[PDB]
């Protein structure tokens, strides 16, 4: 590569990161969070606890 | 796909026999790993000296 500090854009070094989510037989264990609300009392509601 | 290991400790006095007690044993650990375990075996750690 010719990286050289006045090179425009299309030969500075460009940082590339590829990722592969897989489902395979194995169970799937990479994912994010869930978010929790407020939590209530006395109060006819419904729930996903 | 799941190995599951459940454990109990207790205090005895009797040497050989095992006691004529009842106790449960607690869930203690899951492992969400797939294996094809069909044999096991035992670890010492002989006194080498
Ligand atoms: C055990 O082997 C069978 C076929 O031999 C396979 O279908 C199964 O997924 C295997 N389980 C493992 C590797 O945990």
Redesign the pocket.
């Known amino acids: 590569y010719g990286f050289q500090p006045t090179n425009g854009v299309g030969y500075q070094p460009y940082r590339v990161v590829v990722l592969s989510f897989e489902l395979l037989?194995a169970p799937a264990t990479v994912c994010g969070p869930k978010k929790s609300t407020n939590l209530v009392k006395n109060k006819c509601v419904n729930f996903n606890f | 796909?799941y190995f599951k290991i459940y454990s109990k400790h207790t205090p005895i006095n009797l040497v050989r026999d095992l006691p004529q007690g009842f106790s449960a044993l607690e869930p203690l650990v899951d492992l969400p790993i797939?294996?094809?375990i069909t044999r096991f075996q035992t670890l010492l750690a002989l006194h080498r000296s």
């Open positions: 037989h | 796909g797939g294996i094809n």
